[PDB]
Amino acid sequence: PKFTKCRSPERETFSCHWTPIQLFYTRRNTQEWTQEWKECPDYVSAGENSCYFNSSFTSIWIPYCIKLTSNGGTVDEKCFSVDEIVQPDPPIALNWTLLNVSLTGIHADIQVRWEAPRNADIQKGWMVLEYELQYKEVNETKWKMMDPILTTSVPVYSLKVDKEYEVRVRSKQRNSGNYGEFSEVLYVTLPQM
Amino acid sequence: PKFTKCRSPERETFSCHWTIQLFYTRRNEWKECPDYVSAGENSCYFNSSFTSIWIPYCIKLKCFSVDEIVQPDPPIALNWTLLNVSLTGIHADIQVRWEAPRNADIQKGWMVLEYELQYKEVNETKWKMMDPILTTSVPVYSLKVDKEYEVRVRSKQRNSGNYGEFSEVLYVTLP
Amino acid sequence: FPTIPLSRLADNAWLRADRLNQLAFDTYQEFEEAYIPKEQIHSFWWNPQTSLCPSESIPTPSNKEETQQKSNLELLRISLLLIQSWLEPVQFLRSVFANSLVYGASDSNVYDLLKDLEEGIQTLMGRLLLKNYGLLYCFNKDMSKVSTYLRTVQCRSSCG
């Protein structure tokens, strides 16, 4: 067995996973390392072969270290602080708006808009979310990636009105962690003039 | 006798002009113009040392705040690229591209710009103004290939200050 | 309009803290992604010299629960305190920032930013090799703290 990873979806709680196996933690909380190795506070909530830490156990900018214990001694051991392991949920409500069509009837512009993950406290400012939107003609293999914006809206230019496109959107905490999973893809078909 | 206008081109410095000394003050103690030369004549120049964005200013020969008097220089390196011409030949779509003012700072984060592009057929009397974008690239559509168009683009920092001077006009002649 | 409303102050204060945050993060990632051996990641948490941080002595909320409990004033102090804790030591990384291909971190940007930000927080208040690696971790953590705190205070008094 080994650790697969850890992930804090909204910077308030986090859970670790792996493939009787136990997990103990310790962290630099009272000052240096004076927290007696403790055991997974919740082995079920985060699913099986996982460990779950609620907001009462989660601390940011604080060093955590976790040990995977097996039949014979320590098997795995990882160290971090929550922000490194922050992976926001995918944005929701993806929806486009037609902006304008050229008179050549070849190209078009659309505004893609979406909503922020429901569990991220951006409203009170505990979280500042950044997004990457990718779009591509439906029959393509490569996706075209936009520069990260901080807005929940963006225009997409010069689409070929005769083609169909699809869009997806990723989420990441501004300046920390990694992007989350892609939202549901949005399919776009422009006015068949 | 008449203070003409004070303005900051990059949000780090600013100058005041008029049509005879100037004294300035801030809040959070009147002082004299630290530079009468640098900004030309009948003008008081304030380097980055006397330029802060937080506390407001009052001057005597008007009261503002650096953000109120921010006008960025005009964008540079304008130029276009044909996208493709409609089959009937009547219209073309191009993509207009440009560069932020040279004083305009990227790595800063302090000066964030948005741009307004205008264009009109060489002989129209009024311009077509597009909704202010945050990019340095934007597509202009349905241009009658029979005409020559001229494009100019101005900038302002986001939700503060006003627009600056238009860039040099870029002329467009479709194939 | 302006007497410089307070939205203005808070907007700008955070934005500033936010740049110092990207600046602090990215050069931190870069450094590591270029000098630190996969097996040496976080080696600073456990080393007799580079364990300590320039602000070990400052009071800091370790989660949303605590942070939100603090008020707009005690949050600006921690932030201003934190900021000043870095005025002299941030220059130890001067080289690091100068030999960096990170977007916007060369010349003196970082230190300058720290200074302006100190002024902005101050205004709002009244109105209201492994050594290098270690410091870069420290600077990011603390920059994240400031950013996070000022954003809270910013989203308190619009936004969404």
Properties at a glance:
heterotrimer; A: 193 residues; mainly beta; Immunoglobulin-like; 46% strand; elongated; C: 160 residues; mainly alpha; 61% helix; Growth hormone-binding protein (chain A); hormone/growth factor; cytokine; phage display molecular plasticity; human growth hormone
Description:
The complex is a heterotrimer, with two copies of chain A and one copy of chain C (160 residues). With 193 residues, chain A is mainly β. Chain A is built from no helices and 14 strands. Chain A has two domains: 1-88, Immunoglobulin-like; 89-189, Immunoglobulin-like (Sandwich), CATH 2.60.40. In chain A, the strands form four sheets. Chain A has a four-stranded antiparallel β-sheet, with no helix packed on it. In chain A, strands 11-10-13-14 form a four-stranded antiparallel β-sheet, with no helix packed on it. In chain A, a hairpin with a 5-residue loop joins strand 8 and strand 9. Chain C has a single domain, classed as Growth Hormone, Chain: A (Up-down Bundle), CATH 1.20.1250. Chain C has helices at residues 6-35, 64-69, 74-85, 94-98, 109-127, 130-154. In chain C, helix 1 runs antiparallel to helix 5 and helix 1 packs antiparallel against helix 6 (130-154). Classes of the chains: A mainly beta (193), C mainly alpha (160). Chain B: Residues 1-175 are extracellular. Chain B: The soluble form (GHBP) acts as a reservoir of growth hormone in plasma and may be a modulator/inhibitor of GH signaling.
- Tell me the helix content of chain A: under 10%
Oligomer: heterotrimer
Integer tally of domains of chain C: 1
Query: How many strand segments of chain C?
Result: 0
Subcellular location (chain A): Secreted
Function (chain A): The soluble form (GHBP) acts as a reservoir of growth hormone in plasma and may be a modulator/inhibitor of GH signaling.
Organism (chain A): Homo sapiens
Protein name (chain A): Growth hormone-binding protein
